[PDB]
Symmetry: D2
Subunit: 726 residues, 4 copies
Amino acid sequence: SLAPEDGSHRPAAEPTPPGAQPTAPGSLKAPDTRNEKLNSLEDVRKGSENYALTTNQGVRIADDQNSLRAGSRGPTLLEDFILREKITHFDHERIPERIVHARGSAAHGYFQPYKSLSDITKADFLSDPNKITPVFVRFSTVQGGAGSADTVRDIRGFATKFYTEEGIFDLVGNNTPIFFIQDAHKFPDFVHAVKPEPHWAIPQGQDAHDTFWDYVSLQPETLHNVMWAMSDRGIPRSYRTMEGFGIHTFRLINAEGKATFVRFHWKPLAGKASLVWDEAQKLTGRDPDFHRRELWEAIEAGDFPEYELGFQLIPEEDEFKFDFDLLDPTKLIPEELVPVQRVGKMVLNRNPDNFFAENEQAAFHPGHIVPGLDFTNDPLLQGRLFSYTDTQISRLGGPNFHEIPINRPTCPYHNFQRDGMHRMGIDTNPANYEPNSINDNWPRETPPGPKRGGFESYQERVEGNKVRERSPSFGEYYSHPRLFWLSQTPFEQRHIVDGFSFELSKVVRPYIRERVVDQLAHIDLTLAQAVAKNLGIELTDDQLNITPPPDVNGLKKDPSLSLYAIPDGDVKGRVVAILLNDEVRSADLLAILKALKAKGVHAKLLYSRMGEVTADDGTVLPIAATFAGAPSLTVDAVIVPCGNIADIADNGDANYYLMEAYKHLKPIALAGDARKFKATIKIADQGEEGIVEADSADGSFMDELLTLMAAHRVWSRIPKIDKIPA
Amino acid sequence: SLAPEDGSHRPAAEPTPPGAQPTAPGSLKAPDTRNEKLNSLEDVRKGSENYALTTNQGVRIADDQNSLRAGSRGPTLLEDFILREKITHFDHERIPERIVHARGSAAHGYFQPYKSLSDITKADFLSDPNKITPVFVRFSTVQGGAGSADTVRDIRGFATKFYTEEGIFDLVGNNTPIFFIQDAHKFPDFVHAVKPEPHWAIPQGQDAHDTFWDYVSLQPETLHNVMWAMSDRGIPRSYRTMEGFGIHTFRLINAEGKATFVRFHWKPLAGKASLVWDEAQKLTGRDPDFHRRELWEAIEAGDFPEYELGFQLIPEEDEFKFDFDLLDPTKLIPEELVPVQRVGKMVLNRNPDNFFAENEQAAFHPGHIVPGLDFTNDPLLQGRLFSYTDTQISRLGGPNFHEIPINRPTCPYHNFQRDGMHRMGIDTNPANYEPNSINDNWPRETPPGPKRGGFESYQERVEGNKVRERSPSFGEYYSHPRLFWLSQTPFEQRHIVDGFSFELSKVVRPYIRERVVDQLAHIDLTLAQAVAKNLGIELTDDQLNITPPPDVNGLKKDPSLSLYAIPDGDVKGRVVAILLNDEVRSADLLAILKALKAKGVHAKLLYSRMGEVTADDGTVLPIAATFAGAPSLTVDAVIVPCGNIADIADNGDANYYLMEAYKHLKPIALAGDARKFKATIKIADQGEEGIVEADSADGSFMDELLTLMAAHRVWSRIPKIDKIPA
Amino acid sequence: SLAPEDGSHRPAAEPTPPGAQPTAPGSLKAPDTRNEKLNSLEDVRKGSENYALTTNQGVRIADDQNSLRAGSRGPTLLEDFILREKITHFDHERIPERIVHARGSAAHGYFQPYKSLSDITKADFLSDPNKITPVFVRFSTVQGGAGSADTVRDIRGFATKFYTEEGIFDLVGNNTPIFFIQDAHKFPDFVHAVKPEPHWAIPQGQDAHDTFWDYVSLQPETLHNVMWAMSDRGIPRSYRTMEGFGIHTFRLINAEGKATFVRFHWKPLAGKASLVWDEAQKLTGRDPDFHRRELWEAIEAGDFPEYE
Amino acid sequence: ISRLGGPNFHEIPINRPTCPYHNFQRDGMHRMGIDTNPANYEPNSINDNWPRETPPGPKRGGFESYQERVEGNKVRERSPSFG
Ligand code: HDD
Ligand code: HDD
Ligand code: HDD
């Protein structure tokens, strides 16, 4: 018995806030959170407590500390089969990572529609507001390996496996509404250009290098998603605070056989929020697991990630009514033209038990659809359909990857397919072919119908010659980038310009930077000029004279394309650093902590060392982390309570904490003599918007602080931060 | 509905004789035959009746006859995910075959001891006669591929997986009591020498080629097993009628820690029986699946394969009491010196459901032992311990092959090993290492003990220098071959000579044949001379003068080494061909079938066409096969009833049936006018031992036939067969 | 032609200081730098300039920008074998990373002894001061994945393959002179304890978590190498400025059959130097490829890494 | 991909073309060819876009599919002419 006698090794099996208890496998942390998929995994869940340690063949091991040798200082013997089994399993633990989105974090949850959608689709999982469908969702970055950092600038994946009663449906989306390229034949080129360069394998998790911008400069179709990635969309605060999109136009098919075109959306109920670049980049060093950690801890705290599924629906007869082609995945459908109709809610409420078994081995593929859905001729979607089945043959070791437990349907599956590596199902059917008489032709085909019918493809008319040709309706590259640019606030536009400027500064061949700037001048001259000024490049008179691309269907902006133009803040689940001193005003700390708790905001008590400090009144304050150990990068706001401020006033870490939080536009609140830190951040005596200050933490101090947190960051501080040495 | 109205598509779920019903998966043929392992496989058995045909993701298929195309004569579309999943699974069905023993046939059963062995071993499965241990047994040839023929001349494997309460123990043996080589380092040399030659990959399932005999001629340690392989041991009648051996000396360890040396035996309760070479060779062309078929149908009929497990036990103090080294796997322990103690019985009573999932994927390995067993320094066994865990990583795809259902232990298994390709178990342990505090160190090591204890190696003393050197005690090659030769009946010696003669005649390089005859002259001059005579080789005076090797501990024979010297014939499960005519004497047929039924012998009614014939009293006799369709090779004896003999008397195929059966030494019985067929096989009017003839098929006629069948073949016939052109 | 007319896309094939030119494949940056191993790879090196783009079966491709479809807005056809070959190869690019030391940076070079060692060893590569042996060296971290950062706190691997005339010798060492554990049977326990924890797969490239310190606390044999890892040895400035060690005692065997015990060392001729923790940790965010980059650029500059 | 272990099966010697082959495909299990191209994508400027596409033509040209006419709905249907 090596556990502490007080039982403190084991986290409580109840919701607890971030940092309050060690994290644990979901079935131990939250044994009563169930759904039909979680329950179906019980056949493979393995416990440990009270069991003997064995080999994989069930033989009990007596001494798991030593190899078998001839003499206690002698050579290891070949006959040690316990050693060799254990080292062999170790030696073959790794499987190939995903070719793209190798870095990702996943959770289980459930989805339910708000009302039946039978009028527009026969998909069973959308047929009844009381039908609950379990989900497994993985969120990811794109470029970096499985061991890369989370808060890089990149697109994010947002992949949802719906375990429906009529089959698995995987909605395999990203967090921006378009992709970089038009036709899947170019996917290896694009991916190779953004991935680490092939001679030296640098850089990891960064588009900031020559080959990515070379390809962008040569393929202007890429510019629209490049605009999104260079905005603060590329650096989300959390997977809970980003949008999701299926990108492609798909079809819904109802029981009468009518097709409606659809694009899929996820709206985050926590709101949209992103980091700023300097914070994101520094956070990749201070905590490369920050998004993975934040998702796991939100679920352990009960701050369940919630998202609303929504559809943009366009009738078949309106296919050609826009200035862009609906089948072109580099174009978005502005919500001002086609609104998102709310469909249902997804809540992620339990972590996995074992990351490798459930996250690493999960296989999502957008070809996994169900009756009631269908594809379109989008030429990027069409090639995706080939890739996601083919890649699993190496990644997951063969054609039986649907028998890996996380991938299994919860509905029935029966067919004539047999064998393959790793075959788990032992088929008893006398027949392995159809048509057969020897088993009365079972299992049997099922005609299509309104419910529980076979899959039949929508009978779309095809007419044309066999060509490798891009549709001319796809040959427009700048109007969507411009619509995105004009829809952003002034501070978002600044962050875009700073994104392009920072990334192009890392491109060693200057002509590439020049070619990118020339493309920017086809989108918007103000953008192009601002980036050029940061790169020391002067636009030519020709460039100054490029006419801007047209409006998109009459629109000159669409505010739903901005993260921040329309307030959607939610403070629940956010966190505040509280910088302690060795004699904290206890009345301040009571008021601060209860106000935060009332709004579901978490706190971390920080000091210059671990252990405890004692408040003016004798209250013992346990310390969560030191100032350097939990930097301001990891919090949303900073509060400094009154007390003995001299204890920390000359602490360089405490001062720099406030300087970093101030640079990154975070709300900062200072009570009583903590206002002596105004000099560290150069705040005027009469104060400034974004800094809460008062004689004590009472009255409206915490409400003012919370109001600032609901607006996420103090954008008005931006011109004040250039001078700050931080 | 495609099944026939009358239900004749589905075999009865009751025991039935070979040929009476179509064969079926074991759980459908014998649903009520149960054991703990078969019951534990219920989680992975999948049915089929009444279920819809789906993709592997659970989506119902409407049309499983057509690809999706643009127009009904148009090109196939990439978006056809149904067709690609089905073709992808097909394209990846095969896995590598086993390096050796790739051809094999398997069944489920159970083992039970006759008495507790706790005085000599603490192995839990041998602790109590009421301990029932499920087994899965795979019988195999050695050289040929998984698609090669069964009745080749070869060594046979006999591998038994015991699913004990203290771990899987695999007894991985062959059907002769020694192996070809002494040290595992030479196994790839020997196996490459016997396998198809590397330039052109010929010959399949045959040792009859230059490289095999080149290795043998240069490595006289092989000669003992080569003598077995050249005897009729090399061509068993059935997996049910051969012996099995573990070959190596292992140890039993009791609760006191005392080690006893043990060699393992399986004694077939159906008796020992083999084919003759011509019959075996021709059977590889008429039915290359004969042993697989015979095993499956025996079990379907309730002719369960039964074997007694036997131990030769040698106390530790007697290690050096023999003329040969107990660790040398090319030496046998004569039963006259150390008797086989009969310790328990194994019954194989259920065929698999799916060959690939349960037989092809089964992994047996002799390093899978349990507490109460241990290894010795036998240098062939020592190297085997490395190979059987290593080879599964490619064959079965990775280190989780114990999770493939058929391989899973039925007792608990818990450890800190994680991940690997197609990981099924989802571990919930917070710890994946020990020692750990965070899960109170579970699962925990267990000290060795008398029951349910951890495995500890027997503390054998090792003293010597690090050397690659063969023990001098292994350097004797001829005395065991000679003891084997002297123990055979005269007809068994003739078949040995004929085996050597036929094989060496296929060696194209004559000096190799000469070098083999020289080795034979070191074993026995009579043998050497008889082989040389058939090869047109004359022994030199030096060869005529080689002194024979010494007796083995005073023995100049041991009849336990002969298949036939001691009567152990059992006719239950054997099969007779009854050659019909278009007017059968029904009284003969009743008397024949009655007497066969009484002894559990099966029959097959044969004619010149399929369909039925009608007997003299009107009984309608259904025909199982034609003369040419079910050759005499496939039966144990032939009976010709009386009736309209002129119907068949000039039938070449019916005459040849009897000539072939007669050449192969099979009993033949002829009733009434069927005695006209005496002329085709040249039998004198007075008759001949092994031909049963009488006026009708009365009761005496059948006892005489059944007595011949209990003696298997009519060996006295051998000098008459030289004249038969068949 | 997409290249700039001034030729500024292509780096000079001469030694240049870090940042002066874009980095390039070895054989194009330093075509005249050769050794027996580098030459022997010429059978499989493949160029590109002036060659047509083809499938892997050697069929020239006319249009590498589009899939084949039925009409220019139509569905992609299964008979597009060019698209499926290209996407199949992409789909199967990745292989499993190394179980440990998955993050590493490598280079070619050569070794030669200062004098013959025939009195203590008959190894051919140590027999003659003028017999040069090619080498390939990979330096690595231990815990993190292939896409983790370079300037973590960790032990570093230092593995040298010597391509000798009497076979390959691999000296597979680390940058500290001992290991954490005594018996290989415990390696999966120790590695599992230091690797990301199994429920949530955190933390990457860091021993700073409960399971590693749990194992340490319960296995005091670890403490020596834990001391080295917590010192600035854990955060070297460059792979050029750390020591290497084989850790184990091995044997040298001379022609007379005498055995001498030996432990192997590499001394960096650039000297020993490490970062400080705040700088190392912030560098994993500002340039997670810092040691990979510094090694490649030192070789491009002519600052060849040398070790005794 | 299973039978020959991955996507570099054209590098097994019997399968290799005797004519030139050059493209932007990289890596995979058992990769033999060591690409020196600074670029592993096209279009690129950093290797002047080599290796380059080739127009179709009478000899030594790029592959182009015959522009057969396709007309019909997306169906899983046997042509009646096959019946
Ligand atoms: C033709 C190839 C191709 C194209 C054009 C795309 N992808 Fe993809 N994608 C892959 C081929 C691929 C892949 C090779 O099949 C991956 C990696 C491994 C896997 O299982 O699938 C994958 C993974 C992958 C994942 C991670 C799934 C997971 O968590 O396991 C997401 C979220 C996306 N992709 C999303 C997209 C979106 C939104 C695209 C454009 C609209 C896109 N993919 C285009
Ligand atoms: C050092 C290597 C080596 C040596 C010396 C032997 N074998 Fe072996 N044997 C193998 C390496 C191997 C193997 C490569 O590991 C096989 C092939 C596939 C498998 O799973 O194991 C195997 C399969 C195999 C099987 C088939 C098991 C099955 O049905 O799947 C049997 C019955 C034997 N062997 C029996 C023997 C006997 C009785 C030996 C000598 C006394 C012997 N083997 C020596
Ligand atoms: C019993 C298992 C075992 C143990 C006890 C060790 N290693 Fe190891 N090592 C491995 C099992 C391993 C491995 C699983 O075999 C690796 C990863 C995959 C590979 O090719 O080798 C490996 C890789 C590996 C590499 C990377 C080689 C490369 O760059 O590819 C280095 C430098 C070391 N190890 C160094 C050590 C040192 C100095 C050890 C202690 C003195 C040590 N290893 C103990």
